Design a protein around this ligand. Structure first.
Ligand SMILES: O=C(O)C[C@@H]1CCC[C@H]1Cc1ccc(C(=O)O)cc1
Ligand SMILES: O=C(O)C[C@@H]1CCC[C@H]1Cc1ccc(C(=O)O)cc1
Lengths: 226, 227
């Protein structure tokens, strides 16, 4: 196999997808073959499609999903609303395992934070990460409260021996501000901050997004991922 | 001693203080002697004073502070900004132990969420709860994202064998939307939802607050907290 990395976050709406896209873009620009697996998508009624964001922003074509739920809710609630079960754990893990190949960086995107249910019954992205021996990249905010949520997520990773590949600040403000600047220094004291994406990066066109991504990450770190 | 409960939250601004006030009020209405302590208060330059707020709302008079910092930031950053040190672990323990008394419910209000550093080095409200054998009451929101934060918080309590006294929804919308109702149902499957404080509870006067508080908690559960 290659390198499997779950891209999780401290919560919902913290920039997981755009960080997934940004890392994919940087990796592809380093010559790395990149696949993204998002087993479960919700909020499809309003048009959510994080795989398409990755495909458009980063140029990834190996974009694997299993289930799509109309309502913009956590997978379990969206599945309950729709009256249909979430996928099975085996579906998700085998899909990722089949995507994984030598020389490839396979990013795995869940929904919401680390402990949200992704597959029936009650299996999370952390469970999946354990099953496929992935490390976890954790997308954080720079906002008030990020320190607790980041420490909570890192503890939960370590509790099941899922290695933390670093943090990415999903949206970095301009100009920072006292709290954002303080949080960035504090976050760097608990884990490597791999990048801090400029606020609004998710709306860029493909060209600007690739330039942003290459600048966002350390070249050597990206190159060493596989 | 009596019963020590730390009142924590999934994060900042989730209603910890109002919940502390609400529980204090319900317990006082049960005849339970209540003390509330706030090891670390930040935001004094903004006028933040959670003890004064619990006193105003619930009529608690036994209010013990320790460290206070001007800036409305996490304790470590507020202390750093003030050129001050955080308190030491033994100072928070002493502050709580001095309050603990048979038949008394002592509430310890944290700053931000459970894993926030309250004492150097990296000492948290969870560490303090371990030191004083306190259970933890977890204030949650009903908003999108609460489920992950609540499970993260409950796992962190269990990782150190800190009993979870239950959850309190810090603000409950009336009427609830689809997500809030789904979240409350999902929260109750995670742990006991002891109360859901009505939105705007913090704005009530002492009489309406006391009524809301007596209505918000199960009086048997409250009385059961303290022997
Ligand atoms: O991936 C995202 O964060 C954006 C999704 C868009 C639709 C709802 C988001 C999924 C989600 C929301 C709340 C919770 C919870 O833990 O309460 C778990 C997962
Ligand atoms: O008690 C509260 O939640 C209200 C305080 C008012 C001013 C800052 C709040 C404290 C705090 C903020 C962020 C974090 C973090 O983990 O980033 C930890 C603690």
């Amino acid at each position: 196999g290659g390198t499997i990395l779950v891209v999780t976050g401290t919560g919902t709406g913290v920039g997981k997808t755009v960080v997934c896209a940004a890392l994919a873009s940087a990796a592809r620009q380093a010559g790395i073959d990149v696949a993204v697996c998002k087993p479960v998508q919700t909020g499809t009624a309003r048009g959510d499609d994080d795989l398409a964001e990755v495909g458009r922003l980063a140029g990834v074509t190996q974009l694997a999903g299993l289930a799509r739920y109309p309502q913009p809710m956590a997978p379990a609630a969206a599945a309950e609303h729709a009256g249909m079960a979430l996928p099975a754990r085996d579906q998700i893990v085998r899909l990722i395992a089949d995507l994984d190949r030598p020389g490839r960086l396979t990013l795995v995107e869940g929904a919401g934070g680390l402990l949200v249910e992704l597959a029936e019954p009650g299996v999370t992205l952390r469970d999946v990460a354990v099953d496929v021996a992935a490390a976890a990249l954790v997308v954080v905010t720079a906002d008030l409260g990020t320190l607790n949520h980041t420490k909570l997520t890192l503890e939960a990773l370590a509790a099941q021996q899922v290695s933390c590949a670093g943090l990415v600040i999903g949206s970095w403000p301009d100009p920072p501000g006292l709290v954002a600047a303080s949080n960035r220094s504090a976050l760097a004291r608990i884990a490597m901050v791999r990048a801090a994406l400029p606020a609004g990066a998710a709306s860029l066109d493909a060209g600007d997004f690739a330039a942003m991504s290459a600048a966002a990450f350390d070249r050597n770190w990206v190159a060493g991922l596989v």
